[PDB]
Design a protein around this ligand. Structure first.
Ligand SMILES: CC(=O)N[C@H]1[C@H]([C@H](O)[C@H](O)CO)O[C@](O)(C(=O)O)C[C@@H]1O
Length: 441
C-alpha cells in the first residue's frame, strides 16, 4: 500500500485545532475536553497547545469505545510536535531531578497501579515509560545534547515519534531519526486509564510550561520510512519560520545568524557602510555539561512589506517581496546595494546599511524564499534591481575593503543559485527573535 494511505488508515487519534477548538479528526470521534487554562499559541502548521503549571491547564481525551484497549497487547506509535524552553543553569540545579510528565495514559493515585504509557521530562532528559498491570517497567531515557543551540529541548519545535513493538522494541525518534531504544518483551497487559491526559503532572517549578501539537496515535509500530514521511508532511513550504520554528513575522526584530557559520553574529561597519560576521560570545558550564554560543548580540533586523497586498497577514510568505531594515539605535536604516557600488570581482554585490548618497539609486527590493533545506528553520533572501533583475541571494564573501581587516562581508550573489543542493550553504539564514524560552545564563 502507499505510505500516505498506511499513515491515514492506522490513525486512531489525531488532535486538530480548527476554529480555536481542539478535536479528534482521526474518524474515531474521541471526546476532547479542554480545561480553562490550556493555551493556544503559534505552531508548526497552525496553532498549538500550550500548557502551564497548574491544575486548570489541561486537555483530556476520553478514548472512544472502539480504541479503549488498542495498546493492551498490540503495537502502537505516539507522535507529536513538542517545544520546551531551554532550562536555565539555575533550574537544572534546583529542579534537575524533578521528573514530571506532560502526556499520560496512566491513572495515578486512585489504586490502579499506573499501568500505561507516559511522556515525561527530567532536567534535560526526555523519557518514555511503559508499565504493565503487574507493574513491570521499560523506559527509554533520551539525554539531550549539551550544545543548546543545537539541542532538541532548548526551545525549538521538534517532532517526536515513539513506536512500540511488543514482540521487540520501543523506539524513540526525534525529527525522523532514532535517538533511543529499549527492548520491551517481558511486558504483559498494559492497563491504562480511559483518558489520555496532556498536562504537567507533579512538576515542581511554577514557571515551567511546554507546547505540544498534532498529538496523534497509530495502531501500528511505524517504520523509519513512514516516520520520515509523517515528519515531512507537517513541513509546509509556503510560510517562513523563525529560528524557533514559529511563523516568520513582519514588523518584528530578529537577530541574523548564518546557518553555515552558526558561531557568528552580523555586525555593522558604520551607517552607510557594510556588514560582516563576528564571533558570538560564550557560555559554558562544565559542572552541568551545557554550553551554547550566546544569543541576542549583533544586528537587529526588521522585515517590512514592499506592497500591502494580501491582507494583514502578520506572517511572511515564501515569495513575498519585502524591504529589510537594520534597527540600530532606535532609528531604522534600509539594507540595499547602491547602483555601481563596490562589489567583488566575480560581481558579489556588497550590501550597504542606510546608504543615502544623493543621486544614486539604491536597489533594495528583496524576496523572502525557502529554496533549500525543508527541516531547518532557515530563510533565503534574494535582492533585485529596479528592472526586476536578480542581484542574487544574500550571503557573505571573504576579503577586505580598504585597509580594514580580512572579513566575511555581507553581499548579494547569483552564485548561490548554482549550488542549491549542497549540504551547507552561505546564503542560509536564521532569524532569531528574543524569547522567554531562551535567556542566556
Ligand atoms: C572610500 C570609498 O570608496 N568608500 C565607499 C564609496 C563612497 O562612499 C561613494 O563612492 C560615495 O559616492 O562607496 C563605494 O564606492 C560604493 O558606492 O559602493 C564603496 C566604498 O566603500
Amino acid at each position: 500500500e502507499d505510505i500516505d494511505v498506511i499513515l491515514k488508515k492506522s490513525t486512531i487519534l489525531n488532535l486538530d485545532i480548527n476554529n480555536d477548538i481542539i478535536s479528534d479528526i482521526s474518524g474515531f470521534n474521541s471526546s476532547v475536553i479542554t480545561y480553562p487554562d490550556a493555551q493556544l499559541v503559534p505552531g508548526i502548521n497552525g496553532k498549538a497547545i500550550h500548557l502551564v503549571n497548574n491544575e486548570s491547564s489541561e486537555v483530556i481525551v476520553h478514548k472512544a469505545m472502539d480504541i479503549e484497549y488498542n495498546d493492551m497487547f498490540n503495537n502502537f506509535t505516539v507522535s507529536f510536535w513538542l517545544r520546551v524552553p531551554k532550562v536555565s543553569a539555575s533550574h537544572l540545579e534546583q529542579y534537575g531531578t524533578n521528573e514530571y510528565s506532560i502526556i499520560s495514559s496512566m491513572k495515578k493515585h486512585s489504586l490502579s497501579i499506573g499501568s500505561g504509557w507516559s511522556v515525561s521530562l527530567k532536567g534535560n532528559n526526555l523519557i518514555w515509560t511503559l508499565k504493565d498491570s503487574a507493574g513491570e517497567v521499560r523506559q527509554i531515557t533520551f539525554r539531550d545534547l549539551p550544545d543548546k543551540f543545537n539541542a532538541y529541548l532548548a526551545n525549538k519545535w521538534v517532532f517526536i515519534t515513539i513506536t512500540n513493538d511488543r514482540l521487540s522494541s520501543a523506539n524513540l525518534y526525534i525529527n525522523g531519526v532514532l535517538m533511543g531504544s529499549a527492548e520491551i518483551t517481558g511486558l504483559g497487559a498494559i492497563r491504562e486509564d480511559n483518558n489520555i491526559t496532556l498536562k504537567l503532572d507533579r512538576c515542581n517549578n511554577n514557571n515551567q510550561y511546554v507546547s505540544i501539537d498534532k498529538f496523534r496515535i497509530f495502531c501500528k509500530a511505524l517504520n523509519p520510512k513512514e516516520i520520515e514521511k509523517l515528519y515531512t508532511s507537517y513541513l509546509s513550504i509556503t510560510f517562513l519560520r523563525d529560528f524557533w520554528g514559529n511563523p516568520l513575522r513582519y514588523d518584528t526584530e530578529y537577530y541574523l545568524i548564518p546557518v553555515a557559520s552558526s558561531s557568528k553574529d552580523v555586525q555593522l561597519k558604520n551607517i552607510t557602510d557594510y556588514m560582516y560576521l563576528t564571533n558570538a560570545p560564550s557560555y559554558t558550564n562544565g559542572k552541568l555539561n551545557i554550553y551554547y554560543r550566546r544569543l541576542y548580540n549583533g544586528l537587529k533586523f526588521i522585515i517590512k512589506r514592499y506592497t500591502p497586498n494580501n491582507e494583514i497577514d502578520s506572517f511572511v510568505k515564501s515569495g513575498d517581496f519585502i524591504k529589510l531594515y537594520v534597527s540600530y539605535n532606535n532609528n531604522e536604516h534600509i539594507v540595499g546595494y547602491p547602483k555601481d557600488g563596490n562589489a567583488f570581482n566575480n560581481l558579489d554585490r556588497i550590501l550597504r546599511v542606510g546608504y543615502n548618497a544623493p543621486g544614486i539609486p539604491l536597489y533594495k527590493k528583496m524576496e523572502a524564499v525557502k529554496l533549500r533545506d525543508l527541516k531547518t528553520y532557515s530563510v533565503q533572501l534574494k535582492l533585485y534591481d529596479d528592472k526586476n533583475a536578480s542581484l542574487g541571494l544574500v550571503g557573505t564573501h571573504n576579503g577586505q575593503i580598504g585597509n580594514d581587516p580580512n572579513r566575511d562581508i555581507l553581499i548579494a550573489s547569483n552564485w548561490y543559485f548554482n549550488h542549491l543542493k549542497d549540504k551547507i550553504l552561505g546564503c542560509d539564514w536564521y532569524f532569531v527573535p528574543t524569547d522567554e524560552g531562551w535567556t542566556n545564563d
